[PDB]
Design a protein around this ligand. Structure first.
Ligand code: HEM
Ligand code: HEM
Ligand code: HEM
Ligand code: HEM
Ligand SMILES: N[C@@H](Cc1c[nH]c2ccccc12)C(=O)O
Ligand SMILES: N[C@@H](Cc1c[nH]c2ccccc12)C(=O)O
Ligand SMILES: N[C@@H](Cc1c[nH]c2ccccc12)C(=O)O
Ligand SMILES: N[C@@H](Cc1c[nH]c2ccccc12)C(=O)O
Ligand SMILES: N[C@@H](Cc1c[nH]c2ccccc12)C(=O)O
Ligand SMILES: N[C@@H](Cc1c[nH]c2ccccc12)C(=O)O
Ligand SMILES: N[C@@H](Cc1c[nH]c2ccccc12)C(=O)O
Ligand SMILES: N[C@@H](Cc1c[nH]c2ccccc12)C(=O)O
Lengths: 280, 280, 280, 280
């Protein structure tokens, strides 16, 4: 019904190809279900996590770029990168709707083939957690089988987080940021700091003067909020698929995931809500 | 802040892990930007397409199973598979929002590295179009360089589409379906059949009796609508990124994509809308 | 640029119009901000809640219908009404994205005009909560100021919930549902009932035999999951707008909201996850 | 299961409540179906449109403010309001998924009660259309039945559009904007202007310098894209509900709707895609 237009290239036998550029032979032979006989639902299971890992790879790529922009006081560029980061997190969050068509009786058909394998062992996810600030050195051991993986995590562990680079940015523009944010043991997760309260009150209550800082505060709140949405949707999927069974990874499951939901990446941004006044 | 739970597996050196099961060494080495020097936005571009191909792979996997169910008159199972299929199409549609953060001035930084490559050359996409019924034998020449891919496409070309299998299902349950749907040249795309109008009127106007048929009709309409939504969002993205420039694949671009949006997979389901009356 | 077709009705002076049918004079005169002078953001605030209440009215309309279908063993009809209900709950959940563009310094500009008013006093919301099974007699008093509204809330409180009507449906079809669900004091919130475990294990482990029951089970899990997602997105919005301040309604705020996230509408459906085996 | 905290206001008899503040008595009595006997689906039908009109009211409120900010060179504030406007348009677009659960056989049960009423007679929709730049004087006669309404619509018809106010903003900042945009007959819909091409090339090819203009250009592209998506989803819904029947408003229906999809609010922004080079 749609005729092939003249001008469309067909002899590609020798030029850059779609499959070549996207390395599709490699990409599309990475799905290796283990059930015997084959279980229909295992393909969804694999694809669900693989798409997530691709989005996580991009998210890390963008977040690193956002940090470089902050380091250079390039605010509008940082915000544009963060807008893309938000969209990526939104896709990661939206796609839970697919896996929710998987029932407990379907999953029980192949859960056993997974052995001890678990998202808890996701290097990319932990890399992102660390970069946003949720640094737990306990996680380094989990990755002993992958010394190389452990080393990349150590690297992000030892660098200022996204949030810390934001405070360092604020410091450069006259805000009353404590001196320790210029240099400290970055491997220690940030502890909520009440001396930042007046700093953010001033930004939120004088948006005309501190529009750049204000817009970045709200971006960071967006980023945390969406990440918590991801955690919550994952957790609700776990509840409907395995309920309160222990996880393949060896944790108590839902309870363990709920403990992460109770964490906050950017404590002072949320804390300031209790004291902020009207803008003027 | 979250302490590691006791019981979490960490001696993983000789066991199946997340990364192993999902083949992440292979999956996450498949992104090879060609820009020199590196262009920041090329990683997004690659990931966007690769995630789409992964979803397309799953979509084909599910649609094949839905067809098997239809062949066996397993309606409730067919509907469940179709439900998942809709969610996959929904993800494919939703993710355009990420790519919409790519501006023309960013794209012009690396568009030339793509040469003649184009999603028009996507084997999985064409497989899905053929399976839903949009069979254009002209497309076989796009895949001449890929004997194995051409053969896989030929196979779906030569078998009844999802829609035709639905019509064969209706025939098994006494609906007035022409004999030709029992066996015909399947490689010829379905032509709208006015003798099917009375068939669908009867289903829509007697939903109590033909509830199974009615629900499947609406599933198919859902599937078509979501597919058209994907095409439309893709097309609008093309508009904002390259405007009315010709495509890398050699087509007129937007106009060529608009010609597909003008097509319908399940013509009689939509046609019947003009003549259906009240249910009773 | 688009000419009006001849044939379009333009003289409507004495005929039923769009605005007339939808009562738009009435609908669009119900937004009365109290701020003086008017605060720009107050319109968003009112509209966000009003759109939600309209969706809640429709949700109640649909769920009542689903219950009537259940009472009449009309399963396919019930599922179709539940599908629409799921879409409504999805809109209620998605729209939080609009209100998240409201910042703390913006809100503080008009929060004071609200007095004690709070969504805790949403009659329609509580109606839905009660209908789904979260019954709490302590709420009746909140609506003492509105005896008509209070009475309607008492009515749903006194009738079996959607879940209990599901259990009664199962009883009619041979499932081992305890005698108490035939008639009892419905004003008491349902308590997790261990004797229901065998009932749901059987359904999930023999989906071919019990496809109707299995599909309704998964519909209810869907509804509960989406409702929890609404609560969560509401709670996260509360966090970014007022943080941990006490609510206008007099509660501790986020803490009080978190307590409802711990409630479950359909406890046994989630409980069965721990014991359910492979289907066959 | 959740105890009321002490301190929650339960005696509201004389105080401002949720219902009172939001005028819910007025809002929730605005649903007046005409079917006899009542048709179950008419409620969905009314609510779908009414929620849309509430969002449209908000959208107008925000767009007027965006314009005022524009007139005053307040770019960051303009962009914040536009971001909210985008979210509102996204809700208007997402909610079509609810109405798609309406089947033709359901609709035929009450379509006749509507007479000639149609969304074509939506004053608020037309207001937004006019404000965004698609001005058509032919429309004024449609609201001759509503003199106050017709006049409000004529007012926006004569005022510079959002787009025209953006060009005027560009002219105040040294961009080569033709003299005609300082003053002209605004009732005429904006025609595509080739002399603007070099203006937009300059912006897109020098984003470091023109980051304000670049960001606004892309905001406008965002708004137009989302608006076209609403048109497309509406149109696809019309297709699945009435097919190619003539509309109640007297138009040819789908074909008339498609004609608007070919309209463009910001022609030069899309046009410049064909000539823009790499940014630098
Ligand atoms: C059937 C679906 C799923 C189930 C039942 C499930 C279950 C679990 C459980 C029980 C844990 C805790 C660790 C453990 O004991 O294994 C966990 C953690 C995790 N999962 Fe999943 N999961 C599912 C899907 C997914 C998917 C599709 C992804 C990736 C897209 C994912 C990514 C993660 C991540 C990153 C963690 C670590 C979270 C943290 O450390 O706070 N999970 N999951
Ligand atoms: C910057 C973003 C994109 C642009 C500018 C673009 C442009 C185009 C153009 C011009 C065509 C027509 C064929 C040609 O002349 O090359 C096309 C077709 C196609 N593209 Fe894209 N595209 C984009 C993103 C994507 C993505 C992310 C995918 C995901 C797989 C995709 C999949 C397809 C498919 C399947 C077709 C064939 C459609 C048909 O045959 O009707 N495109 N695209
Ligand atoms: C800035 C926006 C909002 C804030 C700060 C907020 C805050 C709160 C707080 C503090 C409570 C606890 C009761 C109290 O002490 O007042 C609550 C409950 C509630 N809110 Fe909101 N809310 C917001 C928006 C909304 C919207 C738009 C709706 C739309 C329906 C809504 C519906 C409800 C409902 C139904 C409850 C009762 C929940 C329960 O009983 O578990 N809220 N909200
Ligand atoms: C079953 C649902 C619907 C059907 C069958 C339908 C059908 C139509 C038709 C046939 C037209 C062309 C004018 C005419 O001849 O009447 C139209 C236009 C329009 N409709 Fe709908 N519609 C539906 C739902 C809605 C809803 C829920 C809204 C919410 C606002 C809406 C808003 C509009 C608007 C604003 C136009 C004017 C578009 C333009 O002038 O380009 N419609 N619709
Ligand atoms: N955070 C929202 C709203 C927003 C847009 N621009 C802003 C500037 C300042 C504060 C908030 C905003 C967003 O990024 O879309
Ligand atoms: N942790 C999951 C298993 C799992 C979920 N997603 C995965 C992805 C890959 C490997 C394993 C998983 C469970 O307890 O069942
Ligand atoms: N087509 C919609 C609505 C729907 C659900 N069940 C149905 C049965 C018959 C007709 C339509 C429906 C869906 O699949 O969600
Ligand atoms: N066809 C696109 C190029 C393109 C889009 N997506 C792709 C994925 C892979 C290779 C090329 C592409 C263009 O005309 O610009
Ligand atoms: N619960 C999901 C998946 C589903 C569809 N049909 C089913 C039948 C049985 C179990 C689950 C399903 C849905 O309603 O879309
Ligand atoms: N409870 C909210 C106030 C609120 C939110 N949404 C509302 C809707 C109507 C009236 C009041 C509200 C607070 O503590 O700030
Ligand atoms: N237009 C997209 C991407 C974007 C964000 N900031 C920008 C600044 C300039 C250009 C584009 C952008 C958005 O608003 O999310
Ligand atoms: N124009 C629609 C009728 C319609 C759709 N939405 C409406 C809202 C109000 C009044 C009428 C309508 C039709 O031709 O069937």
């Amino acid at each position: 019904l749609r005729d092939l237009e003249p001008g469309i290239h067909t002899d590609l036998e020798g030029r850059l190809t779609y499959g070549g550029y996207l390395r599709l032979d490699q990409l599309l032979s990475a799905q290796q279900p283990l059930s015997e006989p084959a279980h229909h639902d295992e393909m969804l299971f694999i694809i669900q996590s693989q798409t997530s890992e691709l989005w996580l790879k991009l998210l890390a790529h963008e977040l690193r770029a956002a940090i470089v922009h902050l380091q250079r006081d390039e605010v509008w560029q940082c915000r544009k990168v963060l807008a893309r980061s938000k969209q990526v997190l939104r896709q990661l969050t939206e796609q839970w709707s697919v896996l929710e068509t998987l029932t407990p009786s379907e999953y029980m058909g192949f859960r056993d083939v997974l052995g001890p394998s678990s998202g808890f062992q996701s290097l990319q996810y932990r890399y992102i957690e660390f970069l946003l600030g949720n640094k737990n050195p306990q996680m380094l051991q989990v990755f002993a089988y992958d010394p190389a993986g452990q080393a990349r995590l150590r690297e992000v562990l030892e660098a200022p987080s996204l949030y810390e680079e934001f405070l360092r940015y604020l410091a450069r523009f006259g805000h009353a940021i404590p001196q320790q944010y210029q240099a400290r043991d970055w491997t220690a997760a940030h502890v909520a700091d009440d001396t930042l309260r007046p700093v953010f009150e001033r930004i939120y209550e004088n948006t005309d003067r501190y529009w750049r800082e204000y817009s970045l505060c709200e971006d960071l709140v967006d980023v945390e909020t969406q990440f918590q949405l991801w955690r919550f949707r994952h957790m609700r999927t776990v509840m409907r698929v395995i309920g309160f069974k222990r996880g393949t990874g060896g944790s108590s499951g839902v309870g363990f995931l709920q403990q992460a939901l109770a964490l906050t990446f950017f404590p002072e941004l949320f804390d300031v809500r209790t004291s902020v006044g009207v803008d003027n």
